[PDB]
Amino acid sequence: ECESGPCCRNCKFLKEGTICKRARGDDMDDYCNGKTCDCPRNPHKGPAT
């Protein structure tokens, strides 16, 4: 599969812990997980990253 959400390369998963969107406050960024490029969610409402 080519899960084309360039939190991938073009198709290929980034380095497990590589931010899509540089969110801050509640959602502490949005890392591609080696598995998925659906700009994956990172809740962690409180502690950073």
JSON list of C-alpha atoms in Angstrom, two decimals, residues 2-31:
[
{"chain": "A", "resi": 2, "resn": "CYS", "atom": "CA", "xyz": [0.86, 3.71, -0.53]},
{"chain": "A", "resi": 3, "resn": "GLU", "atom": "CA", "xyz": [-0.75, 5.54, 2.41]},
{"chain": "A", "resi": 4, "resn": "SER", "atom": "CA", "xyz": [-0.07, 8.94, 0.86]},
{"chain": "A", "resi": 5, "resn": "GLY", "atom": "CA", "xyz": [-0.16, 11.38, 3.80]},
{"chain": "A", "resi": 6, "resn": "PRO", "atom": "CA", "xyz": [3.41, 12.97, 3.63]},
{"chain": "A", "resi": 7, "resn": "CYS", "atom": "CA", "xyz": [3.81, 12.38, 7.28]},
{"chain": "A", "resi": 8, "resn": "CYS", "atom": "CA", "xyz": [4.93, 9.41, 5.13]},
{"chain": "A", "resi": 9, "resn": "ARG", "atom": "CA", "xyz": [7.58, 9.93, 2.41]},
{"chain": "A", "resi": 10, "resn": "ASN", "atom": "CA", "xyz": [5.16, 9.67, -0.51]},
{"chain": "A", "resi": 11, "resn": "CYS", "atom": "CA", "xyz": [3.96, 6.14, 0.47]},
{"chain": "A", "resi": 12, "resn": "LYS", "atom": "CA", "xyz": [6.42, 4.97, 3.18]},
{"chain": "A", "resi": 13, "resn": "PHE", "atom": "CA", "xyz": [6.03, 5.45, 6.95]},
{"chain": "A", "resi": 14, "resn": "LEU", "atom": "CA", "xyz": [8.30, 8.02, 8.70]},
{"chain": "A", "resi": 15, "resn": "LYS", "atom": "CA", "xyz": [10.67, 7.29, 11.57]},
{"chain": "A", "resi": 16, "resn": "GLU", "atom": "CA", "xyz": [8.18, 6.13, 14.29]},
{"chain": "A", "resi": 17, "resn": "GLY", "atom": "CA", "xyz": [7.71, 9.43, 16.16]},
{"chain": "A", "resi": 18, "resn": "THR", "atom": "CA", "xyz": [7.76, 11.92, 13.19]},
{"chain": "A", "resi": 19, "resn": "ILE", "atom": "CA", "xyz": [5.24, 14.84, 13.45]},
{"chain": "A", "resi": 20, "resn": "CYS", "atom": "CA", "xyz": [2.56, 15.49, 10.80]},
{"chain": "A", "resi": 21, "resn": "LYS", "atom": "CA", "xyz": [1.14, 18.72, 12.32]},
{"chain": "A", "resi": 22, "resn": "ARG", "atom": "CA", "xyz": [2.97, 20.82, 14.95]},
{"chain": "A", "resi": 23, "resn": "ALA", "atom": "CA", "xyz": [0.07, 20.99, 17.46]},
{"chain": "A", "resi": 24, "resn": "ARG", "atom": "CA", "xyz": [0.63, 22.31, 21.03]},
{"chain": "A", "resi": 25, "resn": "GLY", "atom": "CA", "xyz": [-1.38, 22.88, 24.27]},
{"chain": "A", "resi": 26, "resn": "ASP", "atom": "CA", "xyz": [-3.69, 19.80, 24.32]},
{"chain": "A", "resi": 27, "resn": "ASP", "atom": "CA", "xyz": [-2.78, 17.66, 21.26]},
{"chain": "A", "resi": 28, "resn": "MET", "atom": "CA", "xyz": [1.02, 17.45, 21.52]},
{"chain": "A", "resi": 29, "resn": "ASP", "atom": "CA", "xyz": [1.86, 17.11, 17.80]},
{"chain": "A", "resi": 30, "resn": "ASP", "atom": "CA", "xyz": [0.83, 14.20, 15.47]},
{"chain": "A", "resi": 31, "resn": "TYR", "atom": "CA", "xyz": [3.52, 11.56, 14.72]}
]
